[model samples]
Target: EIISPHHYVYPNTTTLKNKYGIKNLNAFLEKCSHDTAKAMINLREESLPEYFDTAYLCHIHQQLFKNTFEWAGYLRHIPFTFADGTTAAMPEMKRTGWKNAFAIGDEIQEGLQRLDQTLAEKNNLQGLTREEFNSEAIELFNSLNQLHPFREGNGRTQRLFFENLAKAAGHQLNFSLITKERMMVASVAVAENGDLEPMQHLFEDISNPEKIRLLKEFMHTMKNTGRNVNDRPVMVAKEGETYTGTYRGAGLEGFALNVKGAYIIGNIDHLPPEQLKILKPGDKITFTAPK
Candidate 1:
């Protein structure tokens, strides 16, 4: 069983097979860090094609660890069981305080297919507002993390993939803003508790805040001008109806008034200038719908 080609480690040992033949875990990790960094620097200089698919992600992994690991971009076909009979798929991350399982064998491809379909449905996240982009990006990250497609270098490859994705989407994501510990904690929360808030907050820390603010301003302008930002219908007051309700503040057509249980946009141009200027939210107001 140890001699199987799909087994990532050297025969009779837990140390993974590497280009440098380093058998010690610590030594292999040290060399891998340097080698992978060099490869990533080179990859950064190249204009990699973006398909936003599993193949694209595999290509990235191949580039990042081609000189370091024999597997490189290949997905793991076998479970990584340790000498003590503990599997790597759901090994307890005691340091990080969580345990998560990775998709193995055919499950890997299935997860990737689902991810591809989701991205295709969203049109590759193009032309989305910054807030929308962040939310969707967080979701994708969580899914990809859960998939954990590669036997090694999944985190690094996924970060690079999202970095490129953000660039293509007209935003910048600086992963440097987050520490490894911070990332691990957030990832653990997602895997263990099904909580996305930690990851969402981490994404917010890395995303360009000024760009988001500017986009929000633009969207607000569009909304105030009666241009629907989304598909929700705008509420407008009906003609010949006397609307008596508490003011719910201003809207596209006029001030929003909650009549009984329904909220409607009712024009207040007929009000005295002094009264209109002083109208506040939660204040009682009455208006006759304009003909």
Candidate 2:
């Protein structure tokens, strides 16, 4: 049951009360979506302060839904339950379906504290390789999803929060690259099974390729390896540079070329079917970095 005084939903109903006085659930959702989209556009055009904490996340939620929700940014006090007698608070709860959120007061507080502590321990995810960054960020994302801090707009708030977090860490995260269905499926996988691969793959897909290239290049010369690092020297790719390396098979974005001990990402999407088919793993190949 919703325990907050500022709860948005009508008593004993899933329909949320909105500023637009939209009593119909679907119509209210549509208007809420429209308003949040505008808020997102405004938020993107401005520079928001980065606290990397629950307050910051709340601020994002408030900003995103201030126009639509009265209880925007407030942590949910309700216990969300599924139709099969399973609740979010239950340890045995495992379902890959969309439902209401459930994390009462202390749980939400504890989750946010853990998130804050984790971010602090990782130093806001700075000075890490691309792979390390993706892993840590996805884990953080999963944690926040479980928190389900606000009554609504958790997805948008967390997405924007991580996007900004990525920007600060010299990476780019564009959530628009992911579809709603795919995102929900990935999130449910994490919430239900604690599996991170689906979300990790989605993170990689949404990342900016150029930023990934730059991050890999930066990792080559960086001395800090506190997060995750190997003894192998990272191979930096430069514009108009020629490098020869053995094909190390495909990665999330493209093919990998093992140069010495490091791997270089190679885009083979431009190659024809026959040419691509001929290049087998472990084959020596010569390629020049594109300008």
Give one digit per residue, the lDDT tens place, for model 1 in 1-291: 433433556667778777888889899999999888899888878774556888889899999988886557766553445443433332221233344565555766787898889878887788888789999989888888877777778888898888888878877676634446567878989988899877775676467563233233333544458554233222344557677889867643346666655444545564566877778889998787656
- Which candidate has the top score in TM-score? 2
Q: Per-residue lDDT for 74 in model 2? A: 63
TM-score of each: 0.63, 0.63
Query: What is the C-alpha RMSD, rounded to one decimal, of candidate 2?
Result: 12.3
Q: Residue 154 lDDT in model 1? A: 89
Q: Positional deviation of 68 in candidate 2, in angstroms?
A: 1.1
What residue runs in model 1 are displaced by over 4 Å at the alpha carbon?
Answer: 2-6, 78-100, 210-291
**Considering every candidate listed, which one attains the maximal lDDT?**
1
Q: Which lDDT values do the candidates have, in the order given? A: 0.69, 0.68
The clash number for model 2 is 0
